[PDB]
Structures are given as C-alpha cells and as structure tokens.
Amino acid sequence: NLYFQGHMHKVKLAAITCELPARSYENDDPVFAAVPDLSESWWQFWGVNRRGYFDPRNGENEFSLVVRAAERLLRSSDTAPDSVDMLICSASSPIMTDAGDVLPDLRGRLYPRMANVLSKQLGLSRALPLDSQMECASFLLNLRLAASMIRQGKAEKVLVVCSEYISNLLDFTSRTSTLFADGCAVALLTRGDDDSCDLLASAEHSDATFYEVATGRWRLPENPTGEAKPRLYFSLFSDFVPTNVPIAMRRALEKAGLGSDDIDYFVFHQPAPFLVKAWAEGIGARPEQYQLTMGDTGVMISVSIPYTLMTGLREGKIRPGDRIVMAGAATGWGFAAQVWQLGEVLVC
Amino acid sequence: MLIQAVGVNLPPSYVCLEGPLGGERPRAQGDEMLMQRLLPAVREALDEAAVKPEEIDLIVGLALSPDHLIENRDIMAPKIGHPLQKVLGANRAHVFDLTDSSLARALYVVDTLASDQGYRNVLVVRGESSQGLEVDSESGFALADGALALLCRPTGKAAFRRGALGGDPAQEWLPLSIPLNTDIRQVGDVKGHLNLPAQPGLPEAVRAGFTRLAGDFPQLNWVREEWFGQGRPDGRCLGPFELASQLRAAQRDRLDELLLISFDPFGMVVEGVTLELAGE
C-alpha cells in the first residue's frame, strides 16, 4: 500500500592491475650524481630505497604500458571491449609521449590526453572517454566518478586508468627528483550483481592555502650545467600538521555510518612514512592495518594507492568481505577518502 | 543540471587569422594571464545568483593554456581551479580539472558527481590565455581567449549525447593536436603548437553535427559553440565563449530548459547536454 524506494546501483571493484617500469634505480645510482645535499637521513626520512623510471629507448612510456596492462586486465576479466561504457584516465605529467597506432606520427605533446586515444587503441567503441586530474589522488577521483556513474545507471562497466610518467618532469640537478617515480594502474568497476561490493561513502575536499608549494613550472634547472634549456619541471619552493586526510576519512566514515573499528584494513597514499603514520594515527588505524610501499617503488603520484591496494589483495592482507578505507592527499591541495565494502577483486 | 548564472570576460583585442579554419577571435595580449579575466567572470556569476564564495561545494576547471594562468605566468600545474579557490575563499569546495574535455561532457559528468554527493553550488569554468601556444598559421585555427563561469545546481537528470560530425559520413576528420615545443630557449617562448590540418568542410560538418544531435531533443531550444569564422558575421567567433550570449538570451526569454552542444576538436565529435535554467 506504499510506493517503492529507488536504489542506487552497487559499485563492484571487479579487477585491478599495475605495470611498473622494468628497470629500478638505487639511491646511489649515477642518475643522482648532479644532486647536492644527499644525506643518509634524507633517504631514511622519505623511506624510498628504489624507484622506477620509464625507459623510452625500449618502448616504455605512459601509453604503451597502459595498453599492456589494460589488455591484460580485459582478457583476464573476460571483458569485451565494446562492453566498456566509460574510460576515465589520469596522468599528472602535462607531457605525453606516445599515442600508439592511433596517432603514430605524434611524439611529445601537451594535448590530447589519453582517454580517447586509448579507447580507439583498445577498441572500446562504446566507451565515453574522460581525462580527469587530481594529481596524487586521481585514482580515488576516478573511482568516485565511476561509482556515481554506475550508481545513477549511466554506466555498467567503467575502466579506470592512472599512468604517471613523472620522470620527464624531474629536475635531476635537485634532490626533489629522488622521491617520485613512474608506474601504471588499471582497474575495472561494474554494476554490482549482488551486495558483495559497494562504495559505501566518500568525502572529497580541497584547500589551496599552500598551492604554490608544489607546482609544475617552466624554468631552468636548479643547478644547471652548461647551456641550460628551459623545461617543464616539478618545482618545490616555499617557506604544518597533516589533518585534512583524517578529516576526509572521518567525513567518509560518518556518511557510511561506520567507525574506525569497523574497518578491516587501510590503504594510504605513499608520500612518506611519517605522513602515513600521521594519517593512520589521526583516524585510529594500527600499524598492522596498513602497508608502506614507497620503499621499492617511490612516490608514484596517483599510482601509489592502486599499487598499495593491489599488494594488499595479492598478499592476503585484504580479503573478500573486508571493509577498507582508501585515503590520501594531493598537490593543489586536495584530499579524498573512500569507505569500500569489498568482495572478490580479481588481481592480474 | 541547473544553470544558476553565467559569467563571461573576454579580452577586447581581436586577432584575425586566414585559412579554412581561420577567423577573428579574441586573444590575450602581452603579459595578461587567465586569472585576470576568470575571477571577474566568476564573481559576476556568483553575484547574479546571490551565492557567496563560501557556499561553493565544487570547482571544476577547463583550460588548455600551458602558461599565463596566474600571477606567476610560468606556473602550469596544479590547474587554475586551485588558485581560483584561494582568491575566492571557497574553503568548503572540492577542486579538480577535466583537462581536454568538452564543456558539455564536463557538465554531464559534474551533474552526476555533484548530485550524487549532495552538492548544491557547483562552479564549472572554461578559460584560455593562449600566449604560450602557437596558432596553426596554415589552417588558421586558434583558440579564443577569455573566461566563462557557469554556476550550476546539480539535479542528476541531465541527458547527454556524443554525436558524429555531419558532412561525408565516411570522411576521416583529422583531429586537433598540440605537440610540445621541442626547441624552447626562453621561459617566455611558446610551449606548444596548435595543429589542426586545413579542412575546409569541417566548419559546416560541425554545424551539421550540432543540428543532428539537436534532433534527439526536438522540443528543446539549444545553444552552441562556434570555433570557426567561416560563415560567421565579420568572421568573428568566440569558440566555447559564444555560449554566454546565447545562454543569457535564453534567460531573457524565460526558458526553463535548454540543450547545450559543444565541439570537441580532439575527438572530432559533437557533445550535447540537457540543462535547466533559473528564472527571474
């Protein structure tokens, strides 16, 4: 004798995969020969011991490894290309380098971005291409965008891609180049056919007070050698408590009607050990409820989260039916947190 | 998606380029940067809608310009949305950027996100200050400079279409690209080159695509983007910024629903989004 309530579709995190560069670089690698002010305390503070750099000489770029990862994931998940309704890509480096067979003769470019080109390469003939940017938190944004699209019935399969070719913006005459690294991540979100998986709640907010701290700027090297050519460089010049990430997690947990003790595991962005430790304690997460993964990969901008999520799944730290929280910060600055009810997530 | 108010601020300096894809378009001069025009455009929309900057829940930006964005003309990232948040004082707002998306596609995605997250005041901004991009002197193509501010109220009910260009259906339209400048010698040099091959049938094919896509919503009046001077009075066109006058005209005529159609030069398609309008 009453009407029926409309229900948002549940969002299933179906599959995930990452593609890292084949070659690793130690802290004593000659690449940092021109870098001054390299102390042993510097390395220990940031928790990075190895890092990955794309090697274009052997076909490693932001696009080729995405095709590989995407094709691997599509085949492993038995997902037909024409069944993908939306493709959301992110790449923090404004400089792209490869467009595969779509635009074969196009090399270094500022535009177009990746979504449309990749969809043509992969044959996603029915996919709406989108390219979003939230820097280190772009993977969470793309899940948020995909989830809302699925919830409102505007898409049933969304392919998410984060490809960070940040090494092409590192000033190797400055120690700022010692932290960040390259990497790729691909994830598939679909309409849930049951209650196994869903994005329970999320919270996104931004604060531009310290915008000029971390920027991409056209400038000369910090310690140039010889005839120095201007380039687009990651620039960190400026002269604090990490509370916004906990704020985002509290907001997300409250929207989901949960508390920190209801969460089985946590996945944080990987800027530095002392920041992950600050975020964790700010929300009440114990050390055994999260991992530090920057040690062997470096800070892969938007890929650190999906890579940490993958290792958590692959290593059995995250299991089906677990409730997890994913959170992180990003230059801008922005902050995102997500409360996920996870089911079976295909790792490939 | 409801349009609460529209704001626009274009440079008075018009520059004419010849070619099949040429025209007379506004162009930022000297050391001018985008925020000089974006901020007044935003404040115009906020004032029109009686919305204070504190009330803004979301800011989404669209700007291809690789420099001349803010006071420090050399900064390219993070995108202009974050500087805007700072000067506005939109401390409650979330900020991100949709890069080379069309405005129609962005309004559709944003309407989805913002409605799903319960936002009430959303700000979508499109702007250019393209001193750092060399125009395509062969075809005449060039981006119009200026700023457009759309203050929106999400509803989640916006419809979307991604349609093909008109003309010969078998013609492979060569898309726009912006290659990086390989020989940068001074920080002031252009950072990229606009490359849109000369295609004399493109301006009409885009117009034909607009009319075709509008056929999916025959009950709606519609507004459009004009990226090319061909067939236009005086050869003038404002690109995406043409929407401001058309939107305001729809407001004067007290329309409560509209179809907004964009042209995506990168994907060589047309994209439409259905919208609601606020009355007087």
From Swiss-Prot, chain A:
It is an enzyme of class 2 (transferase). Keywords: Acyltransferase, Cytoplasm, Transferase. GO terms for biological process: fatty acid biosynthetic process; secondary metabolite biosynthetic process. Gene3D superfamilies: 3.40.47.10. Folding of PqsC and binding of octanoate are promoted by PqsB. Binding of the octanoyl group probably increases the binding affinity of the complex for 2-ABA. Activity of the complex is inhibited by 2-aminoacetophenone (2-AA). Changing residue 269 to A: Alters binding properties for both 2-ABA and 2-AA. Almost loss of activity. It holds the Pfam family ACP_syn_III. InterPro entries: ACP_syn_III_C (IPR013747), ACP_syn_III_N (IPR013751), Thiolase-like (IPR016039). SUPFAM superfamilies: Thiolase-like (SSF53901). The active site is at residues 136, 269. The keyword Cytoplasm applies. It is found in: Cytoplasm. GO terms for molecular function: 3-oxoacyl-[acyl-carrier-protein] synthase activity. GO terms for cellular component: cytoplasm. It comes from the Bacteria. Its main location: cytoplasm. It catalyses: (2-aminobenzoyl)acetate + octanoyl-CoA + H(+) = 2-heptyl-4(1H)-quinolone + CO2 + CoA + H2O. Required for the biosynthesis of the quorum-sensing signaling molecules 2-heptyl-4(1H)-quinolone (HHQ) and 2-heptyl-3-hydroxy-4(1H)-quinolone (Pseudomonas quinolone signal or PQS), which are important for biofilm formation and virulence. The PqsC/PqsB complex catalyzes the condensation of 2-aminobenzoylacetate (2-ABA) and octanoyl-CoA to form HHQ. First, PqsC acquires an octanoyl group from octanoyl-CoA and forms an octanoyl-PqsC intermediate. PANTHER family: 3-OXOACYL-[ACYL-CARRIER-PROTEIN] SYNTHASE 3, BETA-KETOACYL-[ACYL-CARRIER-PROTEIN] SYNTHASE III. Forms a tight complex with PqsB. Belongs to the thiolase-like superfamily. FabH family. This is 2-heptyl-4(1H)-quinolone synthase subunit PqsC. It comes from Pseudomonas aeruginosa (strain ATCC 15692 / DSM 22644 / CIP 104116 / JCM 14847 / LMG 12228 / 1C / PRS 101 / PAO1).
From Swiss-Prot, chain B:
SUPFAM superfamilies: Thiolase-like (SSF53901). Gene3D superfamilies: 3.40.47.10. It is found in: Cytoplasm. One of its GO terms (molecular function) is acyltransferase activity. GO terms for cellular component: cytoplasm. One of its GO terms (biological process) is secondary metabolite biosynthetic process. Keywords: Cytoplasm. Activity of the complex is inhibited by 2-aminoacetophenone (2-AA). It comes from the Bacteria. InterPro entries: Thiolase-like (IPR016039). Belongs to the thiolase-like superfamily. FabH family. Forms a tight complex with PqsC. Required for the biosynthesis of the quorum-sensing signaling molecules 2-heptyl-4(1H)-quinolone (HHQ) and 2-heptyl-3-hydroxy-4(1H)-quinolone (Pseudomonas quinolone signal or PQS), which are important for biofilm formation and virulence. The PqsC/PqsB complex catalyzes the condensation of 2-aminobenzoylacetate (2-ABA) and octanoyl-CoA to form HHQ. PqsB, together with PqsC, catalyzes the coupling of 2-ABA with the octanoate group, leading to decarboxylation and dehydration, and resulting in closure of the quinoline ring. This is 2-heptyl-4(1H)-quinolone synthase subunit PqsB. The lineage of its organism: Bacteria, Pseudomonadati, Pseudomonadota, Gammaproteobacteria, Pseudomonadales. The gene is pqsB.
